[PDB]
Design a binder for these strands. Structure first.
Ligand SMILES: [Zn+2]
Length: 635
RNA sequence: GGAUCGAUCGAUCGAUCGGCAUCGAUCGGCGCCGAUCGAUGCCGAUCGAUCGAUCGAUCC
């Protein structure tokens, strides 16, 4: 039922000016959006009809919004549909838009439509609502819609432009340190989303706080381990692994430039990735030993990264969790290859494993962070026996690992399997949520706590300046609400005109396609896969090979999660077909009826025929060559 | 497969402050010392811009 708080938040969009409204709940935002839909469609007289469009970023919020919009719009004679990825092909989108009003499409569909040529203008819609509207920052699908609207408006061909109301729970601060910078960022958001009103609660603050989460920050800066025997053993393992890895390259230190590469840190992982991408462009002209040293090194660097991830886990989660992580990696990599390099590294791991299992089983080497995490979990489960603890870690490799520690520690018995009837849920990004714990990271039942366990004070100072930024954002929101309307309209017109001018400034022209027929090699294996003359791009994004000689150069493996993206259908994952390479290459797909595997340039390297230089690319847009479109008449 | 966002970290550049090292100008005392100003190199603290890596999430 609509209360005075929702009507006070929904007041400035009744007049007909765009808003960036802020409600801290989700159901209140949904009710306000439904109220704006009701008042906006009911204001039209006979002979005209409105086309209020709702945008939802993710699939579950799209399904929730589609269910709510279908449930409420039953007694008003209003039709409701929503389009998504599994709905995109089905029937053509122009017939859905032209024969309905309340489209709840996800924004990437509209971005693809306005890029294609369908939906010739944004003036068909009469109101536009943006769920989670502070995402309109840079190159977002919401921002692509807003760039289209600003090019339609400021170009001089503006017609019946839609109202551009928003929906969020936080305006955001960004890279702002002073109050003028926060005001500049909020004005930049208001100009990019093209609004002159920021609606927030100013009078009915008493009934607002009945659903507000209101966290209680309880930071605990607690020191790390002292007796690092496992770190000593595996650090010696990286030391002699890197020393034996220098028997094939005499300039491994000259490949990278990131110094202070201490083990167990993200800086070491960055050094490992940089030295892997530095070795991956190897051009020794023997072309038979080159595959051998590239395969050997790649095994060395994947072992090094696996060891570094083992100490990152052992720093955060248990010692034994690092041991099972390394044992699982060696068990999965033993079946992939049986050469001298793999056997040598595996027999080195079993020659260290006899002391590794002795060190890991020692109960005097437990992590102190896990000890006081168990202590605080014990005391909050003792205070209340129905606490749902959310646990935020940095990586998914910890997500099961801490869970195994939850399945390993005998002092706790009220913790239950909840890896994401579940007592504790451990995840990485986002319900009751009575307790939140952030383990080295940076709902209902009000009175919640948000513990933060870090071995560094930088995260504590970041959360302190985050609280200062929240207070300063609320102060800048009140300051912008105190301003006059016409000066704010002139300000957002100036800011969005400067934004449109600097957007048209960064319009790079078409790059030229390189005329040579370049050859693609494996990342880890350096085998002849295909030439670029046989590389056809299908829908200006996806690339494939129609070569008959390419068909025997790969092998198949069953896909764990097939899912029909766009008009394609996944069937299997393709891999390199050799003795001990087994490198990922792409994915087996069906377009309409053919089975032509689509590759990714991420797991490939590009070599030219004349110069012979090997180039490393991560996205297909960075690759500039003769992009011949895929013709179905050939194969 | 392709795109998008967020957190941490790295590289480069610029700005503010402090410290070390070096070269010149003025004043005072008995060639030496104290003070300030001007310039260069390095490091530390903070901020901004660009690029990248990892991790996570999202969409098509
Ligand atoms: Zn291969």
């Amino acid at each position: 039922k609509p209360r005075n708080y929702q009507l006070e938040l929904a007041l400035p969009a009744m007049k007909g000016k765009n808003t960036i409204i802020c409600a801290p709940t989700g159901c209140g935002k949904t009710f306000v959006s439904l109220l704006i839909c009701e008042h906006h469609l009911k204001k039209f007289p006979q002979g005209q009809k409105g086309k209020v469009v709702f945008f939802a970023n993710q699939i579950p919020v799209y399904e929730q919004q589609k269910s709510v919009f279908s449930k409420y719009f039953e007694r008003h004679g209003y039709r409701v549909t929503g389009i998504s990825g599994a709905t995109a092909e089905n029937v053509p989108v122009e017939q859905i838009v032209e024969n309905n009003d309340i489209i709840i499409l996800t924004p990437q569909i509209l971005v693809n439509n306005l890029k294609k040529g369908t939906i010739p203008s944004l003036s068909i819609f009469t109101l536009m609502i943006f769920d989670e509207c502070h995402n309109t920052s840079k190159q977002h699908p919401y921002n692509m819609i807003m760039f289209n609207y600003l090019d339609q408006k400021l170009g001089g061909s503006s017609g019946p432009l839609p109202q551009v109301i928003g929906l969020t729970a936080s305006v955001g601060v960004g890279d702002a340190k002073n109050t003028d910078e926060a005001l500049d960022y909020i004005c930049k958001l208001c100009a990019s989303l093209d609004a002159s009103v920021i609606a927030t609660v100013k009078h009915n603050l008493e009934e607002l706080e009945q659903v507000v989460y209101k966290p209680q920050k309880f930071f605990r800066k607690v020191e790390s381990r002292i007796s690092d025997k496992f770190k000593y053993i595996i650090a010696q393992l990286m030391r002699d692994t890197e020393s034996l890895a220098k028997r094939i390259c005499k300039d491994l230190e000259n490949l990278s430039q990131i110094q202070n590469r201490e083990f167990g840190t993200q800086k070491y992982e960055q050094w490992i990735v940089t030295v892997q991408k530095a070795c991956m462009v190897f051009q020794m002209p023997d072309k038979d030993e080159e595959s051998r040293i590239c395969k050997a090194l790649f095994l060395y660097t994947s072992h090094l990264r696996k060891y570094n991830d083992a100490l990152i886990i052992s720093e955060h989660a248990r010692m034994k969790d690092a041991l099972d992580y390394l044992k699982d990696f060696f068990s999965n990599v033993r079946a992939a290859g049986f050469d001298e390099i793999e056997q040598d590294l595996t027999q080195r791991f079993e020659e260290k494993l006899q002391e590794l299992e002795s060190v890991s089983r020692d109960p005097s080497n437990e992590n102190p962070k896990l000890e006081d995490l168990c202590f605080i979990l014990q005391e909050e489960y003792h205070l209340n026996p129905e606490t749902i603890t959310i646990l935020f870690v940095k990586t998914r490799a910890l997500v099961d690992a801490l869970k195994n520690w939850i399945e390993g520690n005998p002092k706790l018995s009220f913790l239950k399997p909840g890896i994401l009837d579940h007592n504790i849920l451990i995840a990485t990004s986002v319900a009751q949520c009575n307790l939140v714990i952030l383990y080295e990271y940076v709902g209902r039942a009000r009175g919640s706590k948000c513990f933060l366990l870090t071995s560094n004070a930088g995260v504590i100072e970041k959360e302190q300046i985050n609280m200062y930024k929240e207070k300063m954002m609320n102060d800048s929101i009140l300051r912008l609400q105190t301003w006059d309307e016409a000066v704010f309209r002139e300000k957002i017109l100036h800011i969005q005109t400067h934004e449109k001018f600097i957007r048209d400034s960064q319009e790079k022209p078409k790059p030229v396609p390189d005329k040579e027929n370049k050859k693609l090699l494996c990342r880890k294996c350096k085998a002849l896969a295909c030439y670029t003359a046989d590389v056809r791009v299908i829908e200006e994004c996806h690339y494939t090979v129609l070569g008959d000689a390419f068909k025997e150069c790969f092998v198949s493996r069953p896909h764990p999660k097939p899912k029909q993206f766009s008009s394609f259908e996944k069937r299997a994952k393709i891999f390199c077909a050799r003795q001990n390479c087994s490198h990922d290459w792409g994915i087996h797909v069906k377009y309409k009826t053919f089975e032509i595997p689509v590759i990714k340039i991420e797991s490939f390297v590009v070599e030219d025929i004349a110069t012979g230089v090997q180039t490393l690319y991560s996205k297909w847009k960075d690759f500039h060559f003769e992009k011949i479109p895929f013709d179905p008449a050939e194969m």
